[PDB]
Amino acid sequence: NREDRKAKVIEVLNKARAMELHAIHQYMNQHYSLDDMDYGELAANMKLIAIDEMRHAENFAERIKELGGEPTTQKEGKVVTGQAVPVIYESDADQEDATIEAYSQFLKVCKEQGDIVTARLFERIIEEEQAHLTYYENIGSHIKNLGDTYLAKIAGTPSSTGTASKGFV
Amino acid sequence: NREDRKAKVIEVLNKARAMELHAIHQYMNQHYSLDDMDYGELAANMKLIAIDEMRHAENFAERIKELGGEPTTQKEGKVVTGQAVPVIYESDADQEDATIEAYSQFLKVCKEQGDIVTARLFERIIEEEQAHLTYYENIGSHIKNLGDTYLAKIAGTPSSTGTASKGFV
Amino acid sequence: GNREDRKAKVIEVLNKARAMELHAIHQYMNQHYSLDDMDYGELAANMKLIAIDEMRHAENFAERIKELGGEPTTQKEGKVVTGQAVPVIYESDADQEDATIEAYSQFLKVCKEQGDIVTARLFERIIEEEQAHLTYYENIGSHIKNLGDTYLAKIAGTPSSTGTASKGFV
Amino acid sequence: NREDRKAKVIEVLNKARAMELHAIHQYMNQHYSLDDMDYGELAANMKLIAIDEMRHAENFAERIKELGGEPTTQKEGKVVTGQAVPVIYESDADQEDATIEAYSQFLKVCKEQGDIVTARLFERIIEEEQAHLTYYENIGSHIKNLGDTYLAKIAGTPSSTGTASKGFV
Amino acid sequence: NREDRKAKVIEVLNKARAMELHAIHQYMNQHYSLDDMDYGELAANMKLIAIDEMRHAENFAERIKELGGEPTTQKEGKVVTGQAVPVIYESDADQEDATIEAYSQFLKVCKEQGDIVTARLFERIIEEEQAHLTYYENIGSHIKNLGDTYLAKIAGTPSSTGTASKGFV
Amino acid sequence: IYESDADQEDATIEAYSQFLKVCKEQGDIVTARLFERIIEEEQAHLTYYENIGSHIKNLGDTYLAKIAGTPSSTGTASKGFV
Ligand code: FEC
Numbered sequence: 033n034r035e036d037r038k039a040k041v042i043e044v045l046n047k048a049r050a051m052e053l054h055a056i057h058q059y060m061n062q063h064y065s066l067d068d069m070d071y072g073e074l075a076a077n078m079k080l081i082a083i084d085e086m087r088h089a090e091n092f093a094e095r096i097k098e099l100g101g102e103p104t105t106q107k108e109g110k111v112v113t114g115q116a117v118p119v120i121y122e123s124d125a126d127q128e129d130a131t132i133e134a135y136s137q138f139l140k141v142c143k144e145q146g147d148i149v150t151a152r153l154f155e156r157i158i159e160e161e162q163a164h165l166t167y168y169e170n171i172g173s174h175i176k177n178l179g180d181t182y183l184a185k186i187a188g189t190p191s192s193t194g195t196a197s198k199g200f201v
Numbered sequence: 202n203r204e205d206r207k208a209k210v211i212e213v214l215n216k217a218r219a220m221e222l223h224a225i226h227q228y229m230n231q232h233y234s235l236d237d238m239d240y241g242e243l244a245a246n247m248k249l250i251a252i253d254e255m256r257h258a259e260n261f262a263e264r265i266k267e268l269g270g271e272p273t274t275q276k277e278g279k280v281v282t283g284q285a286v287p288v289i290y291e292s293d294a295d296q297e298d299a300t301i302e303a304y305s306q307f308l309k310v311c312k313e314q315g316d317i318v319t320a321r322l323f324e325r326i327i328e329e330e331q332a333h334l335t336y337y338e339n340i341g342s343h344i345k346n347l348g349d350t351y352l353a354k355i356a357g358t359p360s361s362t363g364t365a366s367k368g369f370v
Numbered sequence: 371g372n373r374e375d376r377k378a379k380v381i382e383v384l385n386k387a388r389a390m391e392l393h394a395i396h397q398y399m400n401q402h403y404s405l406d407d408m409d410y411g412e413l414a415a416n417m418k419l420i421a422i423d424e425m426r427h428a429e430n431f432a433e434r435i436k437e438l439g440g441e442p443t444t445q446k447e448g449k450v451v452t453g454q455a456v457p458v459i460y461e462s463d464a465d466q467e468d469a470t471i472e473a474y475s476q477f478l479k480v481c482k483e484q485g486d487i488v489t490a491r492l493f494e495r496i497i498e499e500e501q502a503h504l505t506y507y508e509n510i511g512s513h514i515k516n517l518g519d520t521y522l523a524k525i526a527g528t529p530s531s532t533g534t535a536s537k538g539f540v
Numbered sequence: 541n542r543e544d545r546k547a548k549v550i551e552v553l554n555k556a557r558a559m560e561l562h563a564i565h566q567y568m569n570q571h572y573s574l575d576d577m578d579y580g581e582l583a584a585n586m587k588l589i590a591i592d593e594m595r596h597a598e599n600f601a602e603r604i605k606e607l608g609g610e611p612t613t614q615k616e617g618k619v620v621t622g623q624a625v626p627v628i629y630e631s632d633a634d635q636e637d638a639t640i641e642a643y644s645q646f647l648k649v650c651k652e653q654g655d656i657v658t659a660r661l662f663e664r665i666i667e668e669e670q671a672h673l674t675y676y677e678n679i680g681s682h683i684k685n686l687g688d689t690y691l692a693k694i695a696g697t698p699s700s701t702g703t704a705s706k707g708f709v
Numbered sequence: 710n711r712e713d714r715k716a717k718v719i720e721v722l723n724k725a726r727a728m729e730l731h732a733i734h735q736y737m738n739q740h741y742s743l744d745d746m747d748y749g750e751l752a753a754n755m756k757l758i759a760i761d762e763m764r765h766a767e768n769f770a771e772r773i774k775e776l777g778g779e780p781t782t783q784k785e786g787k788v789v790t791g792q793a794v795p796v797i798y799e800s801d802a803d804q805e806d807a808t809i810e811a812y813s814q815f816l817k818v819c820k821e822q823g824d825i826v827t828a829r830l831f832e833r834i835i836e837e838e839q840a841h842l843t844y845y846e847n848i849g850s851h852i853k854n855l856g857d858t859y860l861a862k863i864a865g866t867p868s869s870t871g872t873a874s875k876g877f878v
Numbered sequence: 879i880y881e882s883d884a885d886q887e888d889a890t891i892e893a894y895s896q897f898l899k900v901c902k903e904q905g906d907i908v909t910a911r912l913f914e915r916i917i918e919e920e921q922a923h924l925t926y927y928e929n930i931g932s933h934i935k936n937l938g939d940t941y942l943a944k945i946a947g948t949p950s951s952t953g954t955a956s957k958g959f960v
Pocket residue numbers: 222225226227229230252255256258259262274365366367395396399400422425426428429432444532534535536537
């Protein structure tokens with residue numbers, strides 16, 4: 033029925049959302065490390081990708097409300113900390129790839145439940161995850177093939193991501 | 202194959218267009234009432250949504266022509282007049298929901314018939330119907346929950362939808 | 371007659387005219403889709419622009435019907451003719467605009483009889499716009515009749531745009 | 541099996557790409573004739589559409605690389621030269637119609653191989669092929685129905701396609 | 710013999726053109742690989758040179774038409790794929806050099822056939838090939854002498870070649 | 879071809895109609911009658927060339943497609959000496 037159709041879509045939406053919450057904390061944790069290491073452009077792009085995941089989490093939450101459900105506040109999995117630079121980019125590529133696989137499954141569920149608006153949302157976000165995927169693979173390729181010679185170039189670059197957060201104060 | 206496929210898509214396209222024609226007359230009728238009641242903001246937005254349905258009617262017609270068919274000129278269903286404000290918003294949300302449901306099945310037909318262009322057309326319009334649905338649900342909620350304090354706020358507002366219609370004269 | 375009766379007779383001619391507009395909107399838009407399909411851009415565009423004039427007429431009639439206390443009709447008068455070839459489109463639209471002006475002038479007399487100055491003036495203004503439509507259609511028809519394909523060859527591939535898109539909700 | 545889903549998608553991408561290469565050479569061949577016949581506006585649009593097909597070939601190659609494959613440099617079919625003006629537009633409409641049908645099928649494969657990103661690529665390009673189709677059908681209609689009077693209007697028109705190609709030198 | 714003169718010039722113009730068509734695909738293949746490796750500046754200049762080769766093909770074609778011939782659509786030789794970065798620049802320098810040698814002979818034939826306009830077209834394009842040769846020798850030289858130090862500088866650079874291709878849609 | 883051929887037949891008939899006049903003036907009834915008969919034949923050529931021009935004009939290549947590849951024989955070969 034209509035109610036079961038919505039509940040099944042809400043379920044994959046909250047699963048995706050929980051994955052987004054995990055990515056936000058995982059990438060920001062890496063952001064703090066790269067920043068601490070003073071690899072500015074890497075620090076900045078890692079934070080800009082975290083913000084894309086924040087935006088995904090919010091979009092998933094808004095559709096869940098539209099369907100009458102509650103947006104989860106729990107993250108899926110655990111954040112891995114203290115990763116060395118090569119492990120950061122190899123693991124983040126792995127995560128992006130597994131995310132696209134899972135969201136492609138969630139998309140299918142939306143289509144089966146005849147939910148056109150939610151399947152389109154997954155499709156749009158999956159394209160953005162593909163851009164994250166390509167970025168992490170590329171950095172990993174340079175670390176693998178060029179090592180510290182590549183990092184020497186990143187050392188001390190600007191880490192800014194733009195004007196500060198439009199906020200309340 | 203091809204001929205059969207085309208005919209099946211033209212049939213759902215005309216069914217949808219017939220629903221668009223119904224919606225144009227139903228929403229404009231309610232628009233005349235709201236204007237007469239002098240709830241400008243509600244009057245204005247109802248007409249703007251009616252113009253979205255006109256553009257949907259026109260996009261369906263154009264696709265129908267591209268497929269070799271003739272666009273229908275009869276609306277589906279009867280127009281309901283004399284609806285009071287609470288009924289206007291409850292019914293329109295009901296209509297938008299039913300529209301998304303039907304278009305979702307029409308979309309499926311396009312996919313089964315291998316017509317990607319028409320499927321994409323439905324997809325886009327369904328997203329615009331979701332916006333209509335949300336708008337009507339929202340007005341309905343404030344009329345249910347707040348009445349007069351909310352209606353007094355709408356009383357006497359501008360009902361202009363912008364600059365006058367580019368026409369022939 | 372009395373106040374109510376006076377409004378009622380005027381509401382009745384307003385709904386007859388409005389129903390004629392609804393018909394014009396669908397008939398002209400039907401021809402618009404065909405012209406567009408044939409890729410006669412300038413013709414397709416002016417046909418739609420005239421259909422939009424009729425939408426405005428329908429809306430104006432409606433707003434006056436509500437001001438008089440009545441209910442604007444949603445049924446179109448007559449049926450739409452589909453599949454007309456180009457020469458038939460312009461000959462029939464010219465006939466229809468003529469018939470419209472004929473009927474609206476009778477409707478105006480009724481408004482004057484019922485002592486409704488505002489509604490009478492509405493019909494007057496709209497009759498003037500219908501005259502513009504008639505002259506347009508007669509001129510196209512005349513060139514089609516006299517110049518044939520050589521006239522149409524010049525319209526082929528012209529822009530069909532009616533300007534910026536429909537200020538709508540989404 | 542991850543690798544087999546990529547192989548199968550890469551295979552249809554290279555088929556579509558080969559079709560793009562054919563179109564590029566076919567449409568530019570016709571552009572050289574149209575210019576030679578001094579029908580500028582027709583020559584110009586023919587070249588602009590060939591550049592669209594160049595972009596498609598590029599987009600397909602980029603996706604083939606993201607999937608780990610090698611973008612083909614072989615075109616499908618044979619270029620037909622020496623076509624008169626009516627025959628250019630009747631064959632090009634036929635070509636575009638055949639491309640949309642083929643691409644719709646390739647899109648099906650992408651969906652079957654669980655590849656949402658490539659499927660969306662195909663759907664985007666199919667929409668552009670539909671624009672090419674309509675264009676060629678309209679020109680061909682004018683030639684069939686109006687011939688010389690129509691061509692008289694095109695004779696001696698401008699043929700520029702805009703600012704010259706940003707190149708290396 | 711007028712016609713004989715034209716025929717011999719058209720022959721070398723189609724030989725040159727087939728050489729251009731080969732270069733477009735060879736260079737673009739390498740562009741796709743350099744883009745994949747994320748060496749943006751190299752990928753960008755490779756494509757810009759490919760576009761210069763597209764313009765050469767177009768100019769040969771137009772001269773072929775002025776002479777009453779038909780421009781070839783088949784490339785000369787085979788595209789080599791999978792080249793390592795040093796091999797890309799070593800072979801592109803060899804090809805550019807081979808091209809200037811051939812075009813220089815083709816230019817001689819035009820003069821022998823008393824065709825001043827075609828000879829001047831060759832002289833102009835040869836100067837551009839010299840610009841290409843110099844570019845490939847320079848990059849080849851940095852790779853030989855600087856190794857991964859040079860690559861480290863190119864990793865992550867912009868790959869943009871400007872605004873998108875003015876096209877039909 | 880057909881446009882100039884129609885103009886040329888029309889001209890001929892004009893010219894021949896004056897040559898006929900000269901024949902009547904010189905009292906040459908036989909030569910007047912020769913011009914009369916031949917002018918009648920030129921009129922058949924004129925009509926033929928006008929018709930082809932009109933079809934080419936109004937139907938173009940659609941018309942020529944029908945003619946493409948038709949027989950061109952004008953019947954049995956020239957009776958000659960060899
Ligand atoms: C008023 C009124 C009616 C009567 C309804 C009733 O039940 O009273 C009315 C009725 C119709 C009906 C049917 C159709 C569908 C015709 C068909 O597809 O056969 C129909 C179709 C269209 N109208 Fe329409 N309408 N309408 C306006 C007012 C009215 N309209 C205003 C105002 C604008 C504003 C124009 C603008 O600035 O974009 C406007 C524009 C459009 C466009 C153009 C959209 C575009 O190009 O983006 C199309 C198509």
